[PDB]
Amino acid sequence: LPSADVYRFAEPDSEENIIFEEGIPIIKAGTVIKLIERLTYHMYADPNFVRTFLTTYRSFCKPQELLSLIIERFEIPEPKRFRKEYIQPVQLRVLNVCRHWVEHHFYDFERDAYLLQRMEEFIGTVRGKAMKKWVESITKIIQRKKIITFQSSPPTVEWHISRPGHIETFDLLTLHPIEIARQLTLLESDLYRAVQPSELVGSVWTKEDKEINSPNLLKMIRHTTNLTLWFEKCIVETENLEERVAVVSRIIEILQVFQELNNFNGVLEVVSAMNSSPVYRLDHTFEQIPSRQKKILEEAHELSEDHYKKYLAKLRSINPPCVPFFGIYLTNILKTEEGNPEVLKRHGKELINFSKRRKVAEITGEIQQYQNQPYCLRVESDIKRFFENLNPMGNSMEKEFTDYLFNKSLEIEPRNPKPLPRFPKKYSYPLKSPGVRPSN
Amino acid sequence: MTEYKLVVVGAGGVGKSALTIQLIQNHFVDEYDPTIEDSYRKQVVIDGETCLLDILDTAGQEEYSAMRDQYMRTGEGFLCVFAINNTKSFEDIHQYREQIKRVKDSDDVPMVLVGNKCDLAARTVESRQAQDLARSYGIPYIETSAKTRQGVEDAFYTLVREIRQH
Amino acid sequence: XHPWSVA
């Protein structure tokens, strides 16, 4: 026997309130006042419903109004022993929800100082010395946030033509291919691990304030784009056909090392550089490519076909660490959010569709899964700093630079009827690849 | 039967993903899951002939610009989409078409120009200027609505017909 | 298709 509902959201579960998905019930839609009711249910505690709600709630509720209605949930009026038994765990759930909130989603409070003020006021209001001794934990979490050994030692850093410290002489054919793939895998794994779910939920990276709300995601995407462009620029600006096949071969070797290190982001970097307009038509250059590397590149390219069928397969099969490809996740998230209704309607009443939010949360979780295990590879500071300050475009813009690349391709390999002119050599050092199998 | 590889190109942020979804979203259904093959393949009969449309919409990946070529080299027909309420999405169409032409190595690629309209905004691109641009490119123009399904079927069918008549 | 032919 709870209150009269004129002092609570105690209205019993109805079809105008909640609908579940055909041993805890999976909520599929419901009025917000009952959504939080199930979030702080007395019958049972649902930790995954908490983890999913607090990650995907801003799309139908602002942090302030959530704090307000959870405070409204914590303040229960009495109509006895039965009812105190009921009141205890509801308040417990509310306080553990606040704990999870400040723990895993503290940004909501860094962007709203008054939200933190309300939270601190609210936790300073709980009474019952036992409960308050338990509340000190949330207090300490707030105060905190306001202020790996592998089996064998990682393999040696490999060098080729550039001796360590000679950063001036760093380039694609100067550094060892294996180490190029390694340092790129490290940088891209760090970029992939830095992306937090607050930058994907709500499709916020596609809206006008994407620079503000998705800085790490855009940083990683720009890195991969920049490297694809650098690959094309190395191929096409190498006007001598001999050196140009050298460049293409080293790039295919780096693709091999990517395939091995399970760095699929870098694999796609390379195969995009190959599928570009300026590079895809260099018939006279791919002619001289060994067949064993042609099959490597073909196996890589087949990963994206039929909507990345083989990529999804291989990613689900391999053992991490790995740098998966992000674009697929982003496409799926955007299409779920903009392809499913924001609310369901029943008996003329609007209920927040939560299933959609749960699916987006699943995609977020699969992103976070691969962010755990790091790479057992030693970083070289200066090679990393070489690939961090690479600017193929320079001061040019997208169209200007794309056209420069395509026109350079036309220059080094004119269309059929015209004969292939030969160019002088660019690189005054040997072009033999030092293999792609390590030293020892 | 014949299978047609369509590609949807257009500036993001204006909800071009409504085009594909509304089509293969067998209607009166509003649930969508972009993880099934059914979520981008659909068999339809056009002008009595049966065919299977496979639609590639890289929505959300607009920032992977260096990949566009790869993606665009997938298709034999293209839908160049712009938002009727967003002028800059209409101005980007020219370089989108230049890029499509460049990757397919052809001055006559099967493509249609389609302008989607979400109601909550006000139109800033009049139908006449889009009709004129389409005429200058030698391609058809169809307007679609992201809330009423109006024009979606026509949009995709006419691209299939541009492929056949090519 | 593709310059990376195979046979």
The whole-angstrom distance between A323's CA and the closest CA on chain B is 16
- Confirm or deny that B77 is annotated as ligand binding: no
- Residue A205 sits at the chain B interface (C-beta within 8 Å): yes
> CB-based contacts of B32: which residues, under 8 Å, 6+ apart?
A335, A336, A339, A340, B21, B25, B39
- The whole-angstrom separation of Cα B125 and Cα A218 is 30
**Resolution at which this structure was determined, Å:** 2.9
CB within 8 Å: A286 and C6: no
Helices then strands, counting H and E runs in chain C, come out as 0, 0
To 5 degrees, how large is the angle CA A66–CA A71–CA A72? 95
- Residue from the list A218, A333, A341 with its beta carbon closest to the beta carbon of B60: A333
DSSP E strand boundaries for A218-360: 343-346, 349-353
Distances (CA, A) of A113 to A108, A416, A425, B76: 9, 67, 62, 54
Q: How far apart are CA A97 and CA A92, in angstroms?
A: 9
Look at chain B and count its residues. 166
Cα–Cα separations (whole angstroms), residue A365 to A372, A375, A436: 12, 20, 35
C2 touches chain A (CB under 8 A): yes
Select from B140, B70, B55 the least CA-distant residue to B100.
B70
Q: What is the dihedral of CA A305, A307, A310, A315, to 10 degrees?
A: 140
Phi-psi region at A418: left, alpha or beta (left = phi > 0; alpha = psi -120 to 50): beta
CA distance A411 to A438: 37
Q: List the beta bridge partners of residue A27.
A: A20
| Chains in contact with A, counting 3 or more C-beta pairs less than 8 Å apart as contact | B, C
Is B42:B23 a contact under the CB 8 Å cutoff? yes
8 Å CB contact of B56 and A307: yes
Rounded-to-integer distance, Cα A155 and Cα A143, Å: 41
> In Å, what is the CA distance from A190 to each residue of A87, A374, A375, B33?
46, 9, 10, 30
Residue in the structure block whose two tokens are 């027909």: B77
Neighbours of chain C (3+ CB pairs under 8 A): A
Closest residue by Cα to residue A343 from A32, A45, A126 = A32
Local structure of B80: helix, strand or coil: strand
Interface contact A341-B30, CB threshold 8 A: yes
- What is the spatial distance between Cα A66 and Cα A68, in angstroms, rounded to a whole number? 5
Q: Which residue in A374, A429, A380, A393 sits closest to A180, CA to CA? A: A380
Rounded to the nearest 10°, the torsion over CA A12, A18, A22, A25 is -60
Q: How far apart are CA A256 and CA A252, in angstroms?
A: 6
Give rounded-to-5 percent helix, strand, coil for chain A: 60, 5, 35
Please give the Cα distance from B104 to B73 (Å, whole number). 6
Sequence-distant (6+) residues with CB within 8 A of A360 are: A56, A200, A201, A333, A336, A337
Look at residues A168, A276, A245 and name the one whose alpha carbon lies nearest to residue A425.
Answer: A245
The β-bridge relationship of strands B141-145 and B111-117 is: parallel
Query: What length does chain C have?
Result: 7
Instruction: Enumerate residues 294 to 313 of chain A having a beta carbon within 8 A of any beta carbon in chain C.
Output: 294-295, 297-298, 301
Structure token pair of residue A82:
């039965």
Find out whether B29 is annotated in a ligand binding site.
yes
Characterize the bridge pairing of strands A18-20 and B77-83. Answer: unpaired
| Residue B35 annotated in ligand binding | yes
B109, burial (CB in 10 Å: exposed 0-12, middle 13-18, buried 19+): buried
Closest to B30 (Cβ–Cβ): which among A307, A340, A359? A340
Q: For chain A, give me the number of helices (H) and strands (E)?
A: 20, 4
C-beta contacts of B42-47 below 8 A and 24+ residues apart: B43/B1, B44/B156, B44/B157, B46/B157, B46/B160, B46/B161, B47/B161
Asked if residue B15 belongs to a known ligand binding site, the reply is yes
- The experimental method is X-ray
In A203-240, which positions are buried (b, 16+ CB within 10 angstroms) versus exposed (e)?
bbbbeeebeebbebbbebbebbbbbbbbbbbbbbebbb
Q: Which of A280, A285, A294 sits opposite C6 (nearest CB)?
A: A294
Residue A380 gets which letter from DSSP? P
Q: How far is CA A90 from the centre of its chain?
A: 35
Q: Quick check: B40 and A340 CB within 8 A?
A: no
**Upper half-sphere CA count for residue A269 (Cβ side, 13 Å):** 30
Cβ–Cβ gap B25/A277 under 8 Å: no
Interface touch B66/A331, C-beta < 8 Å: no
A111 CA: distance to closest CA in chain B (Å): 24
* Cβ neighbours for A286, distance < 8 A, ≥ 6 positions apart: A248, A294, C3, C4
CA distance linking residue A275 with residue A272, whole number of Å: 5
Give the whole-angstrom CA distance, residue A13 versus residue A48. Answer: 21
Q: Which domain holds residue B150?
A: 2-164
In chain A, positions 111-150, which contact chain B (CB-CB < 8 Å)? none
Cβ A332–B34 below 8 Å, yes or no?
yes
- Closest alpha carbon to B89 in B165, B23, B8, B13: B13
Strands (E), chain B: 2-9, 41-46, 49-56, 77-83, 111-117, 141-145
Tokens read off for B149: 């399904």
CB count within 10 Å of CB A381 equals 9
User: Which residues sit opposite B139 in a β-bridge?
Assistant: none
Quick one: how far is CA A341 from the chain centroid?
A: 25
Q: How far apart are CA A21 and CA A27, in angstroms?
A: 6
Longest dimension (CA), chain B: 42
CA distance B157 to B53: 10
- Which residue do the tokens 């959504």 mark? A35
Would you call C1 an interface residue with chain A, using a CB distance cutoff of 8 Å?
Answer: no
> How many CB atoms lie under 10 A from the CB of residue A152?
6
Q: How far apart are CA A422 and CA A298, in angstroms?
A: 28
Q: How many domains does chain B have?
A: 1
Edge-first strand listing for the sheet containing B141-145: B41-46, B49-56, B2-9, B77-83, B111-117, B141-145
**Residue entry with tokens 């620079």:** A211
Q: Using CB atoms, which residue from A206, A221, A359 is nearest to B12?
A: A206
Q: Which residues of C touch A289 (CB under 8 A)?
A: 3-4
Residue A150: φ, ψ to 5°: -90, 175
CB contacts < 8 Å between A and B, how many?
Answer: 98
Burial of A43 (0-12, 13-18, 19+ CB in 10 A): exposed
- Closest partner residue to C5 among A285, A294, A301, by Cβ? A294
- Enumerate the residues of chain C whose CB falls inside 8 A of the CB of residue A282: 3
Q: A10-16 long-range CB contacts below 8 Å, 24 or more apart? A: A15/A346, A15/A347, A16/A346, A16/A347, A16/A349, A16/A351
CA torsion sign for A7, A12, A15, A20 is positive
CATH number at residue B85: 3.40.50.300
Q: Which long-range contacts (CB under 8 A, 24 or more apart) does A214-223 make?
A: A216/A191, A217/A326, A217/A330, A218/B63, A219/A191, A219/A194, A220/A188, A220/A191, A220/A192, A220/A194, A220/A195, A220/A326, A221/A326, A221/B63, A221/B64, A222/B63, A223/A187, A223/A188, A223/A191
Residue A197: cis peptide before it, omega within 30 degrees of 0: no
Cβ–Cβ gap C2/A295 under 8 Å = no
Q: Is the Cβ pair C3, A301 closer than 8 Å?
A: no
Amino acid at A67: L
Asked whether the beta carbons of A228 and A255 are under 8 A apart, the reply is no
| A277: nearest CB among B15, B60, B102 | B102
**Cβ–Cβ gap A298/C6 under 8 Å:** yes
Q: In whole angstroms, what is the distance from residue A401 CA to residue A397 CA?
A: 6
Cα A292 to Cα B86: distance, rounded to the nearest angstrom: 49
Nearest-angstrom CA–CA distance, A278 and A427: 21
Distance between CA atoms of A390 and A230, rounded to whole angstroms? Answer: 8
Establish whether B101 is an annotated binding residue. no
Residues A244, B11: Cα–Cα separation, whole Å: 34
Crossing angle between the packed helical segments A129-146 and A113-123, to the nearest 10 degrees: 160
- Domain limits of chain A? 1-146+327-369, 155-326+370-439
Residues in chain B with CB shorter than 8 Å from the CB of A406 are 102
Check residue A76 and report its DSSP letter.
P
Q: How far apart are CA A302 and CA A105, in angstroms?
A: 39
> Who among A283, A291, A295 is closest to C3 (CB)?
A283
How many CB pairs (< 8 A) connect A and C?
A: 23
